[PDB]
Amino acid sequence: RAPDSVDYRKKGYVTPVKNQGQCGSCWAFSSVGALEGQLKKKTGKLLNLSPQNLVDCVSENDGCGGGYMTNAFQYVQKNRGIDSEDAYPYVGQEESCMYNPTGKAAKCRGYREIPEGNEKALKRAVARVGPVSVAIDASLTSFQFYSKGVYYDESCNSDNLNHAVLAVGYGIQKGNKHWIIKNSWGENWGNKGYILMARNKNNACGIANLASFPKM
Numbered sequence: 152r153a154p155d156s157v158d159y160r161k162k163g164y165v166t167p168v169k170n171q172g173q174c175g176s177c178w179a180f181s182s183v184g185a186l187e188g189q190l191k192k193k194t195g196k197l198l199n200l201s202p203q204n205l206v207d208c209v210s211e212n213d214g215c216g217g218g219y220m221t222n223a224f225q226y227v228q229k230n231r232g233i234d235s236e237d238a239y240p241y242v243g244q245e246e247s248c249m250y251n252p253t254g255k256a257a258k259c260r261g262y263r264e265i266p267e268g269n270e271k272a273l274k275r276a277v278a279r280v281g282p283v284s285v286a287i288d289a290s291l292t293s294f295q296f297y298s299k300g301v302y303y304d305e306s307c308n309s310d311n312l313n314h315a316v317l318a319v320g321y322g323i324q325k326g327n328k329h330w331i332i333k334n335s336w337g338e339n340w341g342n343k344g345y346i347l348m349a350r351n352k353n354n355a356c357g358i359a360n361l362a363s364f365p366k367m
């Protein structure tokens with residue numbers, strides 16, 4: 152059976168929480184987070200990858216205007232690599248693509264998508280693969296000002312996907328099952344940059360509607 156609790160932060164698969172600023176690059180941080188997890192799993196090394204590389208170079212996405220994680224993974228595969236954060240620093244603004252092979256830190260062989268709305272499939276992926284990129288409805292004031300506990304709001308709309316984050320684990324808190332989510336709004340947001348979101352509560356906030364992970 153799959154573990155009843157998994158927390159990749161404890162296994163050293165997760166880099167520190169970042170702050171995306173005003174740029175709508177949540178999709179880039181979500182993608183990089185998933186790649187960072189696979190890189191650690193494959194090479195045993197953990198390092199910050201470049202979301203700016205993705206913002207400036209994934210032509211299929213809209214830079215600071217938004218984009219999909221699947222398109223980001225496809226880029227890394229076709230481009231044959233993505234630079235480290237140190238080599239291509241985050242600025243928080245769209246600029247011409249400056250990718251350079253010299254700073255390459257990871258590669259990608261493709262990606263897989265989680266069946267729409269299937270939390271059991273998402274659980275399997277987090278348990279057997281690692282951190283997974285996911286999209287959610289983060290438009291509610293209750294989410295914006297989250298501080299502690301298992302987040303659940305009857306007003307969340309699973310069809311209103313407007314933000315991308317990273318699932319780095321799952322567990323239970325005071326009898327309530329949850330997903331451990333890494334956001335990209337800085338360490339001062341939520342619980343040191345993280346939020347626990349309701350698990351197995353009918354795909355709350357659309358947690359399993361647009362999930363995917365990279366193949367390495």
Ligand SMILES: *[C@@H](N)c1ncc2cc(Cc3ccc(N4CCN(C)CC4)cc3)n(C3CCCCC3)c2n1
Pocket residue numbers: 174175176177178211212213215216217218219220286287312313314315
């Ligand atoms: C995260 N900070 C963030 N900010 C703004 C977002 C806008 C969108 C919606 C969106 C815009 C553009 C695209 N691409 C370009 C056009 N092609 C046709 C499709 C891809 C995709 C999506 N998002 C998304 C919300 C849902 C999760 C992914 C990001 C924004 N996210």
